[PDB]
Design a binder for these strands. Structure first.
Ligand SMILES: [Mg+2]
Ligand SMILES: [Mg+2]
Ligand SMILES: [Mg+2]
Ligand SMILES: [Mg+2]
Ligand SMILES: [Mg+2]
Ligand SMILES: [Mg+2]
Lengths: 23, 208, 83, 98, 129, 71, 129, 83, 218
RNA sequence: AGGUUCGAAGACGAUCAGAUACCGUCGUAGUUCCGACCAUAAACGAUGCCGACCGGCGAUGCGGCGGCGUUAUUCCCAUGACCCGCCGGGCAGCUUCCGGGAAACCAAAGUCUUUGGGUUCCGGGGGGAGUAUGGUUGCAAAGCUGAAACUUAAAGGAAUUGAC
RNA sequence: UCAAAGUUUAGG
């Protein structure tokens, strides 16, 4: 579902923000 | 029409119109018919310029007269006022009637049993007699029609402003159209009256 | 229709609505040429010759034919001053 | 495709309406949407009406009537058959049944 | 719970009665034998069935006319009873009733004949919304 | 609608300019991108040395091995 | 807003001709309008009109005759250089036989044919056929 | 329909138009020469007064100016006849 | 043998109407396919543009029936474009030919600039469209030929239009709609009201009037 | 600051093969008020804004104008509530071969190959992707801007017959 | 005046 794929993507972006802030 | 001297109003004709009440039209005025109206009274009933009625009635005659074989003026009533009048008109005039339940495509289908290809139609109430009117636009068929205030003037080439609602006025109009197609051309004086009674043409709502 | 020589051409010359100069087509099957009879004057009584008017298929279906016809008559002195 | 000119929701000149909780599902609905029966109804009904007429003290007496405005949501309205479906033509007839 | 007559009966019955109305009557077995002579009906069952409906229309006819049939005497009777002419109603004695709006109508066309003028009716409010 | 008037030229010609990028074939041919991704550095052919014969397997509706060469 | 007057006038008379009118009333008026309409008259496309003076902009009522197919207007008023006029009339009129391109000039408002005669380019305005 | 004398419209169908949409934009209004009962000075009021019109002697009030035409004070007759 | 079951047809059979130009003039519909074949005996040739096979789904597999786009024309002022659908293609084609015949129409033709000889191209730039596919014809000078797509080229030839520049837009690929568009274009070639017309008409009798004494057949 | 109700989270009860769900019982944040952020929604008429023209019909909301009769109030006046009109501009409706449209439909989505009133924003097979990347805004959640390699012959709309 | 009912060759 589109809406949930957005949530998926916004959570995964959130994980990427978090990985990169380790450097 | 040329209400010029011979074929003018006269008192006796107007008094018949008034009795039938062909002047006393309806409540719903269509913007095409505005042309043919004096006023609206109290309550809400329009009144129909009886001169204007005459003129249009005369025109229709000159169209039916120009039809060189009378039998190829078709004449139609779908309603149960005109069915008798259109039949008596056709007898008087020498026309061909189509009284009642007009079969879709009498003017189309080469194939059909009841195939006819007339040069003119003469409708009663164009609101009800609507299938033939539309078929009169697949064949190149001009038209006469006894129109009330409401009656919309789709396809009708020459409208006669009447009280097509009341059976009396309907009958009266048919009998008038007969007189003048007879008088123009045929075996009637104009100075003398006509042997035929207008009561002949009226619909009989089961009485006896 | 004529070519530069003055010699006419073109396999016919269409009718053209009396009420709109609008050329009535080869296959406009809702058209009308309407003959309206004249009279002798002294007696009424249909007098041989006609008055004719063609109308385009469009005008009819527009619902404007009877007014237009009524207007054409009263130009040509068939009808007599409705007012 | 757009099923209805209306959008089944007689709005037009507003751009917001107060909701209504449906009197069955408890669903939320726009007020301008939502099927609405008003039900006046004799309290006692056909069965016992004569039994109670007999055994009322007050002579003659006109009973009462029970007055309820429902608010059926679409889902529930169709289920309970307050409103059936219709053919594309018969959809455009906003007179009530008699 | 079953026996309707087919179109292949109904038609034959109708067409028989049009022509031989006179021969046919109310009793069944009488016209059952009439059906044999005037019509080459193949099966005896079909004959028997046509006749049976033929009675049934005879019964109907003997009590006003039927829609889908042309009896010659009834049509002649219809012609006599729709070419009636009384002493006339479109004259409407002396004194035809008229409104001031239909009076002035006549003044525009120049008239002043025997016709009573009367209105009162204040614009009521026509139908209800 | 369109800018249409008479001293517009700039708006007109600049709007076209900005949009041309939304074309697919044009962005291919104007962002260097694809010439970078070309093994054949914008070239009609390329000489190269074979380093393994590799069977490729065809896409479903056809079944067949396609015998390619790793260059 | 009411940005170009000519362009709505011609559009008004083209809409009228389309629905089969006999006369048509174009509201804000101008020299240019009256000069354009007169050009259309000189080649028999529209009949004799008249220009009602209110003590303001003015109005104009124009009697048609169903000869006028389309009467349009080219915004912007591009500046045609007589060389370029051939191209225009190729991609603007329907044929090399009838139709006109009315362009205003030093010499005055006129159709292209008068401008070619007078050997005078100038700004385009519109076209009719 | 299909034919209307736009330049010669009848007065029954010019009064039933808007003050701007008439062939020549006119006004719908008038000045009136208001009498009143006691003070003999005849004022000259405008139909749509908007001011509360006090007399020339300044005893009475003539018009209570509403939204539309102004409301004249009971016994206060008046005449259009001008222009 | 032809037993005409129309009024018009009876006249044509009695050699009363001398040309189908007379039938066109009064917009009297040609109903009977014999009239047209009689008047255009020879010259009239039928070219089957395409046979599109349609189909539609039954519980029992699918019904498939064919559709024959026939054009017809004298290469000399008259063209038709009949369509007919039948369960077997020859029947569709026979019916298609008859339907083309019933809708042949008189194409106007024009000159380009200098108005000399016989008209060869189209009059004004007429167009005609149908269901997306728009066809624009453009009058073109002598010896150009018909600069056009296959379908119109075949119909325009049949009309008898030696020279024409053409445009189209839309799903030209729908052969039927593309033929039907090109047909509407050359239909309109007469109904463009040029100054060449403008002259106030005459008005004549129409065969139904003229021969009403013959039609009451004696 | 407040916390009745409901109620994400959570906890049990059920239902189910499983149910971390739908049903039931609780219940935190929130749900409310005040004071600061946030700037997005199917924020939809999925329809930019101003300007013109182009068919009917009845209705309704505001203002104005005109009209015979009602209710009345008290005896007229002023009324206000009805009644029948017209005007201006509102929300909408039905209606038609206006004319469009791939259509469903739209008096606008019309006046477009007979193409030009003005002007803004904006799209260019489907995916990758509103991703990465920088820049920027935010306390944050996020927002604005915004690619590419690589992939792929279709994806999509409307409508028809079937089957379900 | 609403229990539960998931799936369906690679082999044309
Ligand atoms: Mg909203
Ligand atoms: Mg729960
Ligand atoms: Mg958004
Ligand atoms: Mg659009
Ligand atoms: Mg364009
Ligand atoms: Mg893309």
């Amino acid at each position: 579902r589109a809406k949930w794929r957005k949530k998926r993507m916004r959570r995964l972006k959130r994980k990427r923000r978090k990985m990169r802030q380790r450097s | 029409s040329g209400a010029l001297d011979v074929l003018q109003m006269k008192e006796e004709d107007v008094l018949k119109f008034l009795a039938a009440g062909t002047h006393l039209g309806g409540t719903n005025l269509d913007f095409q018919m505005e042309q043919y109206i004096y006023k609206r009274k109290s309550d809400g009933i329009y009144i129909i310029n009886l001169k204007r009625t005459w003129e249009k009635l005369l025109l229709a005659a000159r169209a039916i007269v120009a039809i060189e074989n009378p039998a190829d003026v078709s004449v139609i009533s779908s309603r149960n006022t005109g069915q008798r009048a259109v039949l008596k008109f056709a007898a008087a005039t020498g026309a061909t009637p189509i009284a009642g339940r007009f079969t879709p495509g009498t003017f189309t289908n080469q194939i059909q049993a009841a195939f006819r290809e007339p040069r003119l139609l003469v409708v009663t109430d164009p609101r009800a007699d609507h299938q033939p009117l539309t078929e009169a636009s697949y064949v190149n068929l001009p038209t006469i029609a006894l129109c009330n205030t409401d009656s919309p003037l789709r396809y009708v080439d020459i409208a006669i402003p009447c009280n097509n609602k009341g059976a009396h006025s309907v009958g009266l109009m048919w009998w008038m159209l007969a007189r003048e197609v007879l008088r123009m051309r045929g075996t009637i004086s104009r100075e003398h009256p006509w042997e035929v009674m207008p009561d002949l043409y009226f619909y009989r709502d089961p009485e006896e | 229709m004529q070519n530069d020589a003055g010699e006419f051409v073109d396999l016919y010359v269409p009718r053209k609505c009396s009420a709109s100069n609008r050329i009535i087509g080869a296959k406009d099957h809702a058209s009308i040429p309407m003959n309206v009879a004249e009279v002798d004057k002294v007696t009424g009584r249909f007098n041989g010759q006609f008055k004719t008017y063609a109308i385009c298929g469009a005008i009819r279906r527009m619902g404007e034919s009877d007014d237009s016809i009524l207007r054409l008559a009263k130009a040509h002195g068939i009808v007599s001053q409705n007012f | 495709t757009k099923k209805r000119r209306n959008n089944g929701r007689a709005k037009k000149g507003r751009g917001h309406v107060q909701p209504i909780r449906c009197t069955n599902c408890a669903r939320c609905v726009p007020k301008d949407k939502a099927i609405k029966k008003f039900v006046i109804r004799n309290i006692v009904e056909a069965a016992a009406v004569r039994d109670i007429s007999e055994a009322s003290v007050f002579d003659a007496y006109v009973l009462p009537k029970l007055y309820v405005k429902l608010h059926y949501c679409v889902s529930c309205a169709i289920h309970s058959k307050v409103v059936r479906n219709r053919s594309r033509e018969a959809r455009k007839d906003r007179t009530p049944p008699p | 719970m079953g026996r309707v007559r087919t179109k292949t009966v109904k038609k034959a019955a109708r067409v028989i009665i049009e022509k031989y109305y006179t021969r046919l009557g109310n009793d069944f077995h009488t016209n059952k034998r009439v059906c044999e002579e005037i019509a080459i009906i193949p099966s005896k069952k079909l004959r028997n069935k046509i006749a049976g409906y033929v009675t049934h229309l005879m019964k109907r006819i003997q009590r006003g006319p039927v829609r889908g049939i042309s009896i010659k005497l009834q049509e002649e009777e219809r012609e006599r009873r729709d070419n009636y002419v009384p002493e006339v109603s479109a004259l409407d004695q002396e004194i035809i009733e008229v409104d001031p709006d239909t009076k002035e109508m006549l003044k525009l066309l120049d008239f002043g004949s025997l016709s009573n003028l009367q209105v009162t009716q204040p614009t009521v409010g026509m139908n209800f919304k | 609608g369109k800018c249409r008037g008479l001293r517009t030229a700039r708006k007109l010609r600049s709007h076209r300019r900005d949009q041309k990028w939304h074309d697919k074939q044009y962005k291919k041919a104007h962002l260097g991108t694809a010439l970078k991704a070309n093994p054949f550095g914008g070239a009609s052919h390329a000489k190269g040395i074979v380093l393994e014969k590799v069977g490729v397997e065809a896409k479903q509706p056809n079944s067949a091995i396609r015998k390619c060469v790793r260059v | 807003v009411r940005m170009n007057v000519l362009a709505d006038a011609l559009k008004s008379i083209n809409n009228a001709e389309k629905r089969g009118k006999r006369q048509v009333l174009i509201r804000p008026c101008s020299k240019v309008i009256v000069r354009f309409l007169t050009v259309m008259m000189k080649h028999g496309y529209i009949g004799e009109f008249e220009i009602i003076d209110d003590h303001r902009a003015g109005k104009i009522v124009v009697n048609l005759t169903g000869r006028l197919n389309k009467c349009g207007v080219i915004s912007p008023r591009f500046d045609v250089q007589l060389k370029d006029l051939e191209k225009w009339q190729n991609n603007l009129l329907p044929s090399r036989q009838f139709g006109f391109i009315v362009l205003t000039t030093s010499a005055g408002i006129m159709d292209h044919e008068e401008a070619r005669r007078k050997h005078t380019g100038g700004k385009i305005l519109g076209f009719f056929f | 329909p299909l034919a209307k004398d736009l330049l010669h419209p009848s007065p029954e169908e010019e009064k039933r138009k808007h003050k701007k949409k008439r062939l020549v934009q006119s006004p719908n209004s008038y000045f009136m020469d208001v009498k009143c009962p006691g003070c003999y000075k005849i004022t000259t009021v405008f139909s749509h007064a908007q001011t509360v019109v006090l007399c020339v002697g300044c005893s009475t009030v003539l018009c209570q100016p509403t939204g539309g035409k102004a409301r004249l004070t009971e016994g206060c007759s008046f005449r259009r006849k001008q222009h | 043998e032809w037993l005409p079951v129309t009024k018009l047809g009876r006249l044509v059979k009695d050699v009363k109407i001398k040309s189908l130009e007379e039938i066109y003039l009064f917009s009297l519909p040609i109903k009977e396919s014999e009239i047209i074949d009689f008047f255009l005996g020879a010259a009239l040739k039928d070219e089957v543009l395409k046979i599109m096979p349609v189909q539609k789904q039954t519980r029992a597999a699918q019904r498939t029936r064919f559709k024959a786009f026939v054009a017809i024309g004298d290469y000399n002022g008259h063209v038709g474009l009949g369509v007919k659908c039948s369960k077997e293609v020859a029947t569709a084609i026979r019916g298609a030919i008859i339907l083309a015949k019933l809708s042949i129409v008189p194409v106007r033709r024009g000159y380009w600039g200098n108005k000399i000889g016989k008209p060869h191209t189209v009059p004004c730039k007429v167009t005609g469209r149908c269901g997306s596919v728009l066809v624009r014809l453009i009058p073109a000078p002598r010896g150009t030929g018909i600069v056009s797509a296959p379908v119109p080229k075949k119909l325009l030839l049949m009309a008898g239009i030696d020279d024409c520049y053409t445009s189209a837009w839309g799903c030209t690929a729908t052969l039927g709609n593309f033929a039907k568009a090109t047909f509407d274009a050359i239909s309109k070639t007469y109904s463009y009201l040029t100054p060449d017309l403008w002259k106030e008409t005459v008005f004549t009798k129409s065969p139904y009037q003229e021969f009403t004494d013959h039609l009451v057949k004696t």
